[PDB]
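In response to a reviewer's request, we include the raw inputs and outputs for one of the modeled complexes. The four entities were modeled together in a single run.
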Amino acid sequence: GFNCYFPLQSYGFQPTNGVGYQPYRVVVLSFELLHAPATVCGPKKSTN
Amino acid sequence: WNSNNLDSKGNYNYLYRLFRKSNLKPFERDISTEIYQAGSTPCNGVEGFNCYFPLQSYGFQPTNGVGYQPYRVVVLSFELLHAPATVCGPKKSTN
Amino acid sequence: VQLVQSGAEVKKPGATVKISCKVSGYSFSNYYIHWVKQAPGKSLEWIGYIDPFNGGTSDNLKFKGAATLTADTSTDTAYMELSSLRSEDTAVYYCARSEYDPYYVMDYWGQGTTVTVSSASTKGPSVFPLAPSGGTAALGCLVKDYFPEPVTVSWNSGALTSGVHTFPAVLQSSGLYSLSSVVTVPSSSLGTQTYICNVNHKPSNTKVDKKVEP
Amino acid sequence: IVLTQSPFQSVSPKEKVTITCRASQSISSNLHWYQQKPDQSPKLLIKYASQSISGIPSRFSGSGSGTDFTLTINSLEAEDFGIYFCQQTNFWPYIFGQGTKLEILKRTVAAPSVFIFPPSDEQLKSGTASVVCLLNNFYPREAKVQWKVDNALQSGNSESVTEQDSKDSTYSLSSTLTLSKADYEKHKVYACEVTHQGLSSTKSFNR
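The model returned the following structure tokens for the whole complex.
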């Protein structure tokens, strides 16, 4: 109604949208570097 | 004792070391003005990204809270006994 | 819009050339400053774009110098300090201003930073005159045995200008550089006029001044 | 993110040259273009592959279709020549186009001007004897520099530059004949014979 607004809008996502209006698939990693457990890790420091 | 009654101005004559490469040894003093480096790139002696000036002053404003009020801290340090006694409790040397 | 950078360098492999790129003519903070590697005899190759507010920077895998683009907001200088140095890290590194979006638009980059990365020492010229043959005698200077590029060969410390046609250096049998700067001079000017090439080589702190005589 | 450009395209004045940036695998509409005159800050000709950035002449134009990204350049001028770079956008960091060196025909061919020089007295004295030939204002940038020690061929120690771009949009070339002072004195004529489009020249300093 009047002064009542729906919070969450969906773009029309059209392949005809520009480079910046095309939907990007966007992921952002979260990792604490050192100081927290190694579960996903490389060799860590693993010597011979 | 607080210098709020006197030294509060802010008072930027009084200054502190905001960062240093490590913790101090007792009674250790540093007069070095060298520029700080928080990165792996040499700063060329300028402030900036990961480059700052480690010595900051506490501004002392008479309107500051008791936390930001100045205090004049003085220490009278002595070796206790077994060493030559120069300052002493005012008790004269007996017979 | 405008970028002023670090000076010419000769860098050890494994050392770190620190190339400052200082923002003038525009705002450091509004623009990714891209960096690009032009080596002598090569084309442009991406290394990384910096963000001015964001210390985190995408760096190229490719050649990896552990390049860390540090965004200095006090002096408005995007630094590229390139480690893992190599004779291919000898290059002209252009810091490229561009928008902060996935819009990458970069027009006037740095003026270029001509940085040799090599084991060789910085060496300047050994100056020599050139000996001459209606009334125009052919004399000049062959610059010798210097490293790195570039070299600006002036004449008479600004007292000689016209007639000069400068021929950039030979890559020579030593892998070094001999260029011949030649001013076309009159024969009547011979003996009443001094011809001195002043050949400056900056990285080696070398100035040698010498007369050209018939 | 992989693209490549033609190593060079040598075209003629008043002809149009559309320079190719052909991207491998994935592509986005945004792409960029350049001309770089040798040893200079690359200057952006095109923006988002659809837009010539302001300040770029109307002969420089740009477009793209799928993998194809074009810099369409028209009616070459002898001063224009440079190296033409492109930029893949997004899709992970980029390969700049390897460049198009512009070699424009119809520029004026001329006999290279020979300034030929003996070793300086301090070059001879020190023992490093450089007989110095120079080549000026010849198009295209070409030579075979044949040093003649007396009339004989010099098979080693004769120095040869690769011809370079000069201020006039001409091509200047240096050659030095490097000898010991002994090799210098005992041969009378060090002859600079420069084969240019099949045409040698002759100028020398008699040693």
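As requested, we also summarize the result in words. The radius of gyration of chain D is 23 Å. DSSP finds two helices and 19 strands in chain D.
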